[PDB]
Write a structure and sequence with these properties.
Largest interface: A-B, 3 and 3 residues
Oligomer: part of a larger assembly
Radius of gyration of chain A: 22 Å
Helix content of chain A: over 70%
């Protein structure tokens, strides 16, 4: 049983850190997606209309 | 998709300048045409009639 515990029974210590890092990266990705979509309208500024 | 963008999708920066150039030439040519049609009647001026 202790043997089987070493292949199954994922250690939460690394898993929670991975979850936090993934969520942070997802938030950053949403932010940068918004900021990138905020770029083009400078061309409308060029059009001056 | 980026590759297809690099072939289509005219750069607006050059297009706006080209449009400004074309409009300026059009207006200047119209004015010069008016002047050219305003030239001839000196021949009537000669006739003194």
């Amino acid at each position: 049983s202790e043997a089987q515990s070493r292949i199954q029974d994922a250690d939460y210590a690394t898993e929670v850190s991975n979850m936090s890092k993934a969520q942070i990266i997802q938030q950053a990705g949403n932010s940068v997606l918004a900021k990138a979509n905020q770029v083009p309208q400078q061309v409308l500024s060029l059009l001056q209309g």
